[PDB]
Amino acid sequence: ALWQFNGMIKCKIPSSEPLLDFNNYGCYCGLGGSGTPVDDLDRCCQTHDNCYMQAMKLDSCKVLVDNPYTNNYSYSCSNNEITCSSENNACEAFICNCDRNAAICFSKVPYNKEHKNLDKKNC
Ligand SMILES: [Ca+2]
């Protein structure tokens, strides 16, 4: 869910408030997304959106009424490393991996303040 995703990002970027820093960034970081990613961070978000769409296609996820945003899963942050739990059932395990991948992606690319709250006229 959103609360676990927030924590994974802070796990990799301890100085951030991910729900403030990465929401509404580019054409893809935030709800929805279309167009050509504006930079590599925006591309991390595009990949993440695709991952969520893929999760949605899984039989296992289609059984739950809960979408990725509210679907809770278990993970730990230790020494700034993220570990998705073996106790997650298939859907939750898939979503946890989508989240883990984006958090690490976010921690490896430049952050461009001029892409924050981007006019979706660029998308
Ligand atoms: Ca998005």
From Swiss-Prot:
Bridged cysteine pairs (disulfide): 11-77, 27-123, 29-45, 44-105, 51-98, 61-91, 84-96
Protein EC: 3.1.1.4
Entry PTM: Activated by trypsin cleavage in the duodenum. Can also be activated by thrombin or autocatalytically.
Cofactor, how bound (note): Binds 1 Ca(2+) ion per subunit.
Annotated residues for binding of Ca(2+): 28, 30, 32, 49
Keywords noted in UniProt: Autocatalytic cleavage, Calcium, Disulfide bond, Hydrolase, Lipid metabolism, Metal-binding, Phospholipid metabolism, Pyrrolidone carboxylic acid, Secreted, Signal, Zymogen
Cofactor: Ca(2+)
Secreted recorded as keyword: yes
Residues at the active site: 48, 99
Coiled-coil annotated spans: none
GO terms under cellular component: cell surface; extracellular space
Catalysed reactions, as listed in the record: a 1,2-diacyl-sn-glycero-3-phosphocholine + H2O = a 1-acyl-sn-glycero-3-phosphocholine + a fatty acid + H(+); 1,2-ditetradecanoyl-sn-glycero-3-phosphocholine + H2O = 1-tetradecanoyl-sn-glycero-3-phosphocholine + tetradecanoate + H(+); 1,2-dihexadecanoyl-sn-glycero-3-phosphocholine + H2O = 1-hexadecanoyl-sn-glycero-3-phosphocholine + hexadecanoate + H(+); 1-hexadecanoyl-2-(9Z-octadecenoyl)-sn-glycero-3-phosphocholine + H2O = 1-hexadecanoyl-sn-glycero-3-phosphocholine + (9Z)-octadecenoate + H(+)
GO molecular function: bile acid binding; calcium ion binding; calcium-dependent phospholipase A2 activity; phospholipid binding; signaling receptor binding
GO terms, biological process: antibacterial humoral response; antimicrobial humoral immune response mediated by antimicrobial peptide; arachidonate secretion; defense response to Gram-positive bacterium; fatty acid biosynthetic process; innate immune response in mucosa; lipid catabolic process; phosphatidylcholine metabolic process
Cell compartment(s), UniProt: Secreted
Family designation: Belongs to the phospholipase A2 family.
Function: Secretory calcium-dependent phospholipase A2 that primarily targets dietary phospholipids in the intestinal tract. Hydrolyzes the ester bond of the fatty acyl group attached at sn-2 position of phospholipids (phospholipase A2 activity) with preference for phosphatidylethanolamines and phosphatidylglycerols over phosphatidylcholines. May play a role in the biosynthesis of N-acyl ethanolamines that regulate energy metabolism and inflammation in the intestinal tract.
Quaternary structure and interacting proteins, as annotated: Monomer or homodimer.
Protein's recorded name: Phospholipase A2
Species of origin: Bos taurus
Gene: PLA2G1B
Full-protein residues shown: 23 to 145 of 145
